[PDB]
């Protein structure tokens, strides 16, 4: 079934979309630990704008709290709360 | 408030996820990016990576614009990841 233009266009326009982000991007200095899962689902701006002089960037951000397991190789593991950046709103803005 | 471990674990695991992929002087395509299923997320250990195991094509209408001269709807075929697995890296 061919996806009709109207649906392709609405679905791909600049907005916050679920993105699977590795935890080391947000917690880079944690080489002594293994996190599980090692990545988390976050809303991040994605998609395209109508003009090539515009770019899809966040205009409202906040953090989201998730339960993560943090493993110390050979020395057990704990469940804890970690906090990650998410994009609440996104807009097409001039590249400048 | 807080996403629970079971849910973070299940939702983050290697699977096909909707990804907005750019299609690529005379023409502009609109939209310039399309929504496609692409393998993503993570696996149980750092020795494993999430890869596509079943793929297929999907046809979408895309507008081709010659600015201030014309604009046509055309069909384009894109690649989809239907299934993904965690497999040893190398």
């Amino acid at each position: 079934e061919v996806v009709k233009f109207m649906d392709v266009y609405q679905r791909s326009y600049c907005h916050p979309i679920e993105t699977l982000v590795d935890i080391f991007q947000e917690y880079p200095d944690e080489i002594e630990y293994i996190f599980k899962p090692s990545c988390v689902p976050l809303m991040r701006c994605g998609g395209c704008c109508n003009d090539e002089g515009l770019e899809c960037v966040p205009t409202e951000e906040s953090n989201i709290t998730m339960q993560i397991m943090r493993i110390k190789p050979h020395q057990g593991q704990h469940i804890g709360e970690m906090s990650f950046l998410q994009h609440n709103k996104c807009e097409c803005r001039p590249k400048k | 408030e807080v996403v629970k471990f079971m849910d973070v674990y299940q939702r983050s695991y290697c699977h096909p996820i909707e990804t907005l992929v750019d299609i690529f002087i005379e023409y502009i395509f609109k939209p310039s990016c399309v929504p496609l299923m692409r393998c993503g997320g993570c696996c149980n250990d750092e020795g494993l990576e999430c890869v596509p195991t079943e793929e297929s094509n999907i046809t979408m209408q895309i507008m081709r614009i010659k600015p201030h001269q014309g604009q046509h709807i055309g069909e384009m075929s894109f690649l989809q990841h239907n299934k993904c697995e965690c497999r040893p890296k190398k």
Partner: peptide, 18 residues
Amino acid sequence: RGWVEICAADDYGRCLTE
């Protein structure tokens, strides 16, 4: 690649014949 023309269209992606 492989863009196949369907029709001349309006701003909404509808064929002008429509």
